[PDB]
Amino acid sequence: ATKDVATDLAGEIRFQDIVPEEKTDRQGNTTRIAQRGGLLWVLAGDVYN
Amino acid sequence: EQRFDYVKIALASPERIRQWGERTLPNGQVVGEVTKPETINYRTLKPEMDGLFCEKIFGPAKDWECHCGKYKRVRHRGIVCERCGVEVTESRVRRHRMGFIKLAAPVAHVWYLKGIPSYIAILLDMPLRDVEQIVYFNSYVVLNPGNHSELQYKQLLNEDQWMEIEDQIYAEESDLEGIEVGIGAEALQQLLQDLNLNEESEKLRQEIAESKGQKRAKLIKRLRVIDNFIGTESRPEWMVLNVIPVIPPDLRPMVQLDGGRFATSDLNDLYRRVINRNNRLARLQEILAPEIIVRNEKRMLQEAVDALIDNGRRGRTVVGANNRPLKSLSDIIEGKQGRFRQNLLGKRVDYSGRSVIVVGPNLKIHQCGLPREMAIELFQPFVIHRLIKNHSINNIKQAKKLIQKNDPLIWDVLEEVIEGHPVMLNRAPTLHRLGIQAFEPILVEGRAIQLHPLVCPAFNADFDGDQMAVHVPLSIEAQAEARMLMLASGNILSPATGQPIVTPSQDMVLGCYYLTAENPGAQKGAGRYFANLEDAIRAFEQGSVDLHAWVWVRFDGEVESEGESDEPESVVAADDGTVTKTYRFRRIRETEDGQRLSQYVKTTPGRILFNNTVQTALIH
Amino acid sequence: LVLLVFERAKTGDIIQGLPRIEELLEARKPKEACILARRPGVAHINYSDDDAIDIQVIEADGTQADYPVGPGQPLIISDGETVDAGQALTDGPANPH
Amino acid sequence: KHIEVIVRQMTSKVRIDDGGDTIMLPGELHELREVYNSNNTMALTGMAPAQFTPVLLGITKASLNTNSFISAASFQETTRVLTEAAIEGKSDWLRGLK
Amino acid sequence: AYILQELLTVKSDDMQGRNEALNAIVKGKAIPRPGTPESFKVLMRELQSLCLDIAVYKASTEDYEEDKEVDLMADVNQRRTPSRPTYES
RNA sequence: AAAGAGGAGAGGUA
Ligand SMILES: Nc1ccn([C@@H]2O[C@H](COP(=O)(O)OP(=O)(O)OP(=O)(O)O)[C@@H](O)[C@H]2O)c(=O)n1
Ligand SMILES: [Mg+2]
Ligand SMILES: [Zn+2]
């Protein structure tokens, strides 16, 4: 089973101990998997699009 | 001994199909071919002369009476009336006799064309799409390449391409006189008639060795089929139909309800459609119609035959009055409601009953209670026989009148007819072999069946709305089997695990628990001494002792207690070489390294009652 | 931000027990298990960097086998243990085919 | 005992590979004892025997490979079974219940 | 086995055995042996209607003589077969 | 002598 995680803030992103990993399929698409989990920090700010 | 030894199935040739439904008459004519979509006359309810219900083909509709009403009676043993051709015999012959229909054009059997393996496609070494396109008039096929350079044997063509080749050949030129035979039609009988089985078998066997992988396996499959057609000596072209059998008319009844109208049967509609299309195609072919209208009729005839055999297998489904598909021949033998799983592996039976169950105490474990209204109906022939033999009445009619009038004597006869005759009882979900059991019946007054409480867990039944079914054996062998194999007093252990199955269940357990429990309160008469196990019971019935008091009783035998100490709590040695050993629940007197002299047990009157009941039950 | 992947929690009870019996009696393919394919009988766990566990099974003649382990496959053996042909290594329902 | 009786019916066949000269085409399922007896009889003269591989069938695949078409037709897939039996010209000797 | 056989044939659809059993019970004699149920014959006719050649055969006891087909839809005994059981006389 | 034929929907009881 799967569950999405959303954010209630808006700002910059920082990684503490998460270690990303890149995997590819047989069609050329790439997806990123967290090899080592940890904490993901969102720092407040005003975001302009 | 036995009439037959084994059953065999094979493919059917047109000769065998014709032989099934053809019979001759002492005139020189032959009958058996149906040529009209007519069933019966609307004015007088009699069958027509050459339709689906004809009497010359299938047989007379009344016993020993021909169609024109001129020969009757039974003294004739198989003569045929020489004005209408109807044989004079019983109407039971309408359950066996078959007919046949001769088709204007050949059609393909849908079972051998649309299947998980396709046998026509495998035999012809062609994909299923090409074979399906040759049939149903969607493409042409080259049956003979001739002296051409691009054409190949068994090559799919099209209308435009055939037009181009036709222009080339019909240009009155040379080098093209190779007799190109491209026929877009059924055209499968010709391709199947050109097969040589032995040469292809040798070629495939030679080619198998020099191959590997999925290429080999495919060839192997083909080889299999080919060798089959050599073992059975069948012809591969028999998969294309020229004659069609017709089922006896008594298996598709018409039924005369509706006051003025008639009932609906689905096989008759399909047969009528097939006959109509065949007649139209024959008439069109007779007068030399243009060959663009004939192919239409051929296609509709093929579709009609396909719908008759298996509805919805290939294309659209035939729909009756409401948008509900009709029932074909393959829908009668197919599923849970088909012939196999409904009429052959299970049946309805005679001499059976059903009713609600109540609880009967004071019964024996091999006994049941039957209401009189059910019993007087389930045992009628035996009662009639005993009324004729003893208490000589006269004949059967007088006995039936006596039974209907409800004379008091019939009950006296029935009370002794049923004595010694077992009966079988069943509950609806039969999960194991203990769901059917045999009992001995006794007559009761009421409308409910009485059941012994000790057999409820095996049936999984309680008295809040359940119902049971009753069956009666007839022959002596069945009665012996019921008595010696299924009687309810001999089913003690479980076939799944060798554990007891007739243990006391709900209130007997509570009573036995209350009888033998402990009660620090209500200790009246405690400490008394008794001899025998009967003195304690007799004192209890007088009210002089309570039920849970602690008393000493003189008992010689093996005794087990709860928490008894194996070590002698007290030992007292007296003169003349005697010793008294006192335990928690016992007191034993012994001589000098010898035998016992007395033993007393400290117990409760209810435990004495329980053990005395058990001991007494094992001696009777 | 992310999409967590996990295993849902269910009850016991007979409704969840019969499907395993039906799967067993029909000889169908499970979704786990790693099976050793040769006799030898000397296994070295060889804990590598970034948690890349690779079991190495060493024969008496010097063969290596080199079975790799997945990210979420628990181990049911120890280091320096003796193993047999067809014996499971990393838990789960074995494939009988 | 019951589980052993059930399990025995699904672990007692073998798939034939390149049968030498006997009547055994590759891709067929045969009892192990029958193949053993046939090989024992055939190798007495000294010809080439057949190869095989054990298989594990399943409760419903093993019951559709019986020797009688009548019992298989009354279980499942009536039309396919009857078509194959008619093509092969099979016969039924009426052994066992059902 | 005898209970099952009597349930399947005499009590359901053996059109000739029903009357024999009833009259044997009434007269107090033994019940004669059964024959072939009607549903099997109905199934055979339905299968033959699909252009399938299915029949029952009798094994050849001796000699080279081939096995002979048996006609199931034929009368063996010269006795009546009414639709419902009745008390004769 | 005679006497019920199937089918399709909807609702209940173990
Ligand atoms: N779909 C169903 C429903 C009921 N049953 C039968 O009917 C029983 C139901 O018994 P019931 O009296 O309704 O309930 P119990 O479980 O016996 O409980 P209680 O009598 O105490 O209410 C089942 O065990 C089973 O034998 C069944 O076979 N199929
Ligand atoms: Mg209940
Ligand atoms: Zn006449």
Side-chain angles (χ1 to χ4, degrees):
Chain A
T2 54
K3 176 215 290 313
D4 320 83
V5 186
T7 172
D8 37 291
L9 222 50
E12 206 200 311
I13 295 203
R14 192 158 159 187
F15 280 18
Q16 203 133 331
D17 320 70
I18 316 173
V19 171
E21 169 170 1
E22 201 102 35
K23 318 185 44 66
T24 74
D25 61 346
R26 220 183 62 123
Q27 279 210 105
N29 319 71
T30 170
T31 205
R32 255 171 313 115
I33 299 314
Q35 210 216 12
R36 256 210 297 280
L39 286 167
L40 194 142
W41 289 75
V42 177
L43 303 139
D46 213 327
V47 184
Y48 284 110
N49 233 301
Chain B
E1 268 262 74
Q2 312 280 19
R3 299 242 289 141
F4 56 94
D5 277 39
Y6 63 94
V7 201
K8 201 174 120 54
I9 186 172
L11 270 92
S13 48
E15 294 90 37
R16 292 238 54 191
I17 289 173
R18 213 189 257 267
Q19 173 195 108
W20 287 341
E22 196 150 62
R23 49 209 64 97
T24 196
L25 297 189
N27 183 329
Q29 97 280 48
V30 279
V31 286
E33 216 211 314
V34 175
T35 36
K36 239 180 306 310
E38 298 287 76
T39 45
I40 71 199
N41 170 344
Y42 203 54
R43 203 153 288 247
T44 158
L45 310 210
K46 305 234 300 214
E48 320 271 14
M49 202 25 51
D50 251 21
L52 291 162
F53 285 80
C54 156
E55 320 222 341
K56 296 172 37 188
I57 305 161
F58 299 116
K62 274 193 205 10
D63 305 44
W64 319 101
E65 165 177 355
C66 94
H67 187 221
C68 70
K70 147 151 159 166
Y71 290 37
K72 312 222 176 169
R73 298 319 97 192
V74 197
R75 71 267 180 269
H76 294 175
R77 298 230 177 285
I79 74 85
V80 183
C81 161
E82 42 265 7
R83 206 169 137 223
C84 43
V86 183
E87 187 197 35
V88 183
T89 177
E90 299 135 348
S91 35
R92 242 172 47 223
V93 302
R94 299 200 121 214
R95 288 182 75 88
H96 328 304
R97 293 196 184 177
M98 272 198 126
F100 71 92
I101 302 171
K102 172 203 252 183
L103 303 170
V107 297
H109 204 309
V110 80
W111 272 19
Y112 304 113
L113 191 66
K114 316 270 316 153
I116 301 104
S118 203
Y119 289 113
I120 287 175
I122 282 197
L123 246 189
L124 282 189
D125 201 47
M126 306 179 41
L128 185 51
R129 263 169 326 121
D130 303 5
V131 184
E132 264 193 31
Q133 266 184 38
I134 289 157
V135 184
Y136 297 101
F137 301 84
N138 271 340
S139 189
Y140 288 75
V141 66
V142 187
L143 300 163
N144 200 38
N147 47 23
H148 212 273
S149 275
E150 301 53 15
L151 289 190
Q152 258 147 346
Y153 184 50
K154 256 182 296 153
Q155 149 155 54
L156 266 195
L157 272 177
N158 205 359
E159 249 294 341
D160 310 13
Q161 317 188 31
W162 173 237
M163 281 175 24
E164 313 287 69
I165 282 88
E166 211 170 6
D167 270 345
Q168 297 249 8
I169 179 57
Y170 262 121
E172 321 298 329
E173 298 302 289
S174 92
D175 204 79
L176 265 166
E177 40 266 60
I179 318 295
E180 275 71 28
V181 202
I183 290 202
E186 192 59 55
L188 279 189
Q189 212 158 48
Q190 183 87 256
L191 284 178
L192 293 161
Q193 268 164 26
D194 298 336
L195 263 163
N196 213 251
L197 299 167
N198 311 276
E199 268 160 29
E200 249 307 310
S201 202
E202 304 300 299
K203 195 202 299 318
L204 279 159
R205 197 99 38 78
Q206 186 135 225
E207 206 190 343
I208 275 302
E210 35 263 60
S211 277
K212 63 96 174 211
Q214 54 70 351
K215 185 219 216 158
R216 238 230 292 205
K218 263 165 109 293
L219 299 149
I220 290 287
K221 281 192 29 140
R222 205 190 176 222
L223 176 71
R224 229 93 74 77
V225 180
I226 280 179
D227 81 34
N228 271 331
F229 270 98
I230 292 182
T232 80
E233 281 115 30
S234 273
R235 290 306 297 157
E237 63 255 26
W238 288 350
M239 304 200 253
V240 172
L241 305 171
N242 280 297
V243 190
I244 288 291
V246 174
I247 212 176
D250 249 20
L251 308 188
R252 25 166 192 104
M254 206 69 275
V255 170
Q256 181 26 37
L257 191 284
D258 309 16
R261 303 140 309 158
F262 264 85
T264 305
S265 203
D266 284 353
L267 282 184
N268 293 126
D269 304 16
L270 307 157
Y271 276 129
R272 284 206 274 96
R273 294 187 209 224
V274 170
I275 292 164
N276 271 331
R277 202 43 65 154
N278 199 50
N279 274 348
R280 253 173 75 122
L281 176 54
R283 208 254 274 282
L284 277 205
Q285 253 186 341
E286 193 211 17
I287 68 168
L288 302 118
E291 302 72 16
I292 201 193
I293 301 197
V294 180
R295 312 228 278 235
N296 234 46
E297 303 295 288
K298 286 159 137 140
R299 182 191 66 85
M300 329 207 78
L301 178 54
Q302 162 92 242
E303 296 210 317
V305 177
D306 275 15
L308 162 74
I309 293 281
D310 207 334
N311 207 11
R313 192 192 187 86
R314 204 254 152 192
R316 224 193 37 94
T317 86
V318 174
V319 153
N322 165 310
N323 298 342
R324 228 195 47 260
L326 304 187
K327 268 240 298 181
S328 40
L329 278 158
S330 296
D331 290 336
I332 312 184
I333 54 146
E334 244 182 337
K336 169 139 74 141
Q337 312 281 336
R339 207 61 82 180
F340 268 120
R341 275 173 71 176
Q342 268 288 304
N343 296 127
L344 289 179
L345 303 170
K347 287 162 177 236
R348 309 211 171 244
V349 288
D350 286 326
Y351 306 96
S352 46
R354 158 169 279 251
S355 196
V356 195
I357 47 151
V358 294
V359 52
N362 315 116
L363 275 176
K364 254 61 222 190
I365 207 183
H366 60 281
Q367 279 169 353
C368 80
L370 224 67
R372 285 191 334 186
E373 315 98 39
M374 259 182 31
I376 200 51
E377 183 80 21
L378 288 180
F379 282 95
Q380 201 185 77
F382 303 95
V383 176
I384 284 180
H385 163 238
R386 249 208 165 261
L387 272 181
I388 297 272
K389 184 217 198 54
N390 303 131
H391 337 95
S392 33
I393 298 291
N394 224 7
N395 43 334
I396 276 144
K397 300 252 74 183
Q398 265 178 35
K400 221 86 67 63
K401 186 96 48 204
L402 226 63
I403 291 180
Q404 192 231 75
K405 134 185 158 44
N406 204 289
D407 203 82
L409 157 76
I410 72 179
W411 303 116
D412 270 317
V413 181
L414 175 76
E415 199 128 341
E416 81 211 27
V417 153
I418 76 170
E419 174 82 14
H421 201 129
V423 102
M424 261 146 48
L425 254 53
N426 175 45
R427 204 183 153 260
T430 308
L431 294 188
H432 55 184
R433 84 178 202 185
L434 289 168
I436 316 171
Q437 260 163 265
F439 298 91
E440 264 157 281
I442 102 207
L443 297 178
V444 302
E445 272 92 68
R447 292 183 159 108
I449 307 167
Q450 302 187 339
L451 209 75
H452 196 244
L454 271 176
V455 305
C456 284
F459 281 108
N460 194 71
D462 42 33
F463 314 102
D464 61 11
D466 309 25
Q467 296 185 43
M468 273 224 192
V470 195
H471 305 268
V472 171
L474 292 189
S475 60
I476 277 190
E477 287 114 309
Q479 295 179 39
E481 291 186 347
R483 180 167 284 275
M484 293 287 268
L485 290 177
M486 318 164 42
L487 206 69
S489 46
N491 302 331
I492 308 290
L493 303 181
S494 175
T497 55
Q499 305 298 322
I501 215 82
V502 286
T503 321
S505 200
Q506 288 196 8
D507 310 23
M508 329 161 193
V509 178
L510 189 67
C512 293
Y513 186 92
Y514 173 82
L515 190 63
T516 57
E518 277 184 52
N519 202 353
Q523 296 257 325
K524 151 189 178 85
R528 289 229 255 148
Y529 275 83
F530 295 108
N532 327 325
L533 293 200
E534 313 264 34
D535 282 42
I537 308 182
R538 191 180 306 138
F540 166 70
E541 317 245 17
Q542 283 300 109
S544 80
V545 189
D546 261 4
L547 191 71
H548 298 103
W550 288 101
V551 298
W552 290 89
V553 65
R554 185 159 70 178
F555 183 70
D556 267 279
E558 273 301 282
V559 49
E560 61 147 286
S561 319
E562 241 296 11
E564 173 88 297
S565 68
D566 206 13
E567 69 66 6
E569 144 187 318
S570 182
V571 176
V572 166
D575 307 317
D576 40 317
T578 63
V579 281
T580 96
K581 327 171 138 73
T582 306
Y583 311 84
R584 220 186 136 178
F585 297 115
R586 255 188 320 156
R587 194 194 85 114
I588 298 200
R589 197 153 163 269
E590 281 266 12
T591 168
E592 272 302 330
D593 287 311
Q595 43 257 325
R596 289 194 338 225
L597 305 167
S598 330
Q599 181 201 226
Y600 296 84
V601 190
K602 188 214 221 155
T603 176
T604 280
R607 287 159 190 190
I608 290 167
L609 252 168
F610 186 85
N611 292 281
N612 205 41
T613 284
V614 170
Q615 278 167 23
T616 287
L618 278 183
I619 290 155
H620 278 342
Chain C
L1 300 167
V2 289
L3 173 96
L4 311 160
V5 182
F6 65 97
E7 215 212 336
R8 194 91 80 190
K10 287 203 174 354
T11 181
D13 159 75
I14 187 61
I15 301 299
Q16 326 269 339
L18 269 185
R20 178 73 180 135
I21 292 286
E22 190 236 343
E23 190 199 51
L24 271 160
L25 280 181
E26 288 281 350
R28 291 184 183 158
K29 270 84 146 69
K31 305 204 197 232
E32 263 168 27
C34 155
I35 272 154
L36 152 62
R38 203 99 183 74
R39 193 34 74 159
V42 170
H44 315 286
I45 302 306
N46 187 10
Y47 292 98
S48 187
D49 201 86
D50 50 273
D51 330 274
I53 322 300
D54 279 22
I55 307 158
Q56 256 214 322
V57 158
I58 279 176
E59 207 145 340
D61 306 353
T63 338
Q64 299 297 301
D66 279 44
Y67 309 110
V69 198
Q73 293 214 265
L75 268 154
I76 58 141
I77 50 153
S78 28
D79 211 321
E81 219 174 75
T82 314
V83 279
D84 297 342
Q87 157 167 344
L89 294 168
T90 89
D91 206 327
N95 186 19
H97 281 282
Chain D
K1 279 201 268 263
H2 314 318
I3 308 203
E4 283 165 31
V5 160
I6 294 290
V7 165
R8 175 83 196 270
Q9 302 289 115
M10 71 189 276
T11 47
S12 71
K13 291 226 189 257
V14 78
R15 188 167 51 80
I16 289 310
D17 260 349
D18 68 307
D21 45 347
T22 154
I23 170 173
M24 274 151 179
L25 265 154
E28 284 188 17
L29 298 163
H30 287 283
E31 198 107 345
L32 183 49
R33 198 140 274 123
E34 305 209 302
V35 176
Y36 175 55
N37 276 353
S38 146
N39 262 1
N40 261 8
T41 286
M42 210 221 63
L44 194 88
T45 88
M47 324 158 157
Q51 334 295 333
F52 43 77
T53 325
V55 292
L56 170 75
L57 283 195
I59 237 56
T60 156
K61 187 198 223 268
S63 94
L64 274 171
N65 272 295
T66 36
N67 261 32
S68 75
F69 69 98
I70 286 190
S71 65
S74 69
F75 173 48
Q76 262 174 22
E77 294 148 346
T78 307
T79 86
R80 196 202 78 213
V81 167
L82 289 180
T83 316
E84 177 180 19
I87 279 285
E88 299 205 359
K90 236 173 297 188
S91 92
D92 199 343
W93 280 91
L94 313 162
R95 303 178 190 130
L97 326 161
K98 229 171 101 147
Chain E
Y2 285 84
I3 300 189
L4 183 58
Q5 206 215 1
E6 152 197 287
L7 265 155
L8 283 185
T9 60
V10 145
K11 282 192 234 178
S12 219
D13 57 5
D14 199 13
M15 302 189 39
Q16 203 184 98
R18 296 191 297 232
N19 320 46
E20 310 265 285
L22 182 79
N23 282 110
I25 292 170
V26 170
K27 294 215 198 40
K29 326 192 150 283
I31 298 188
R33 302 266 82 216
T36 318
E38 202 65 38
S39 293
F40 189 56
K41 315 195 213 217
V42 174
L43 169 92
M44 296 268 275
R45 284 327 218 211
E46 259 143 40
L47 278 185
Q48 274 179 44
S49 274
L50 279 143
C51 317
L52 291 172
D53 208 338
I54 177 145
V56 290
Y57 288 90
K58 170 77 133 150
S60 159
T61 317
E62 79 254 18
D63 216 41
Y64 168 84
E65 175 165 62
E66 59 160 24
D67 307 324
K68 295 198 82 313
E69 195 191 339
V70 174
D71 200 32
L72 266 196
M73 338 273 285
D75 309 302
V76 201
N77 311 112
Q78 42 252 66
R79 68 167 48 93
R80 77 212 263 272
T81 306
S83 37
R84 287 212 219 161
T86 41
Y87 301 92
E88 265 275 65
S89 87

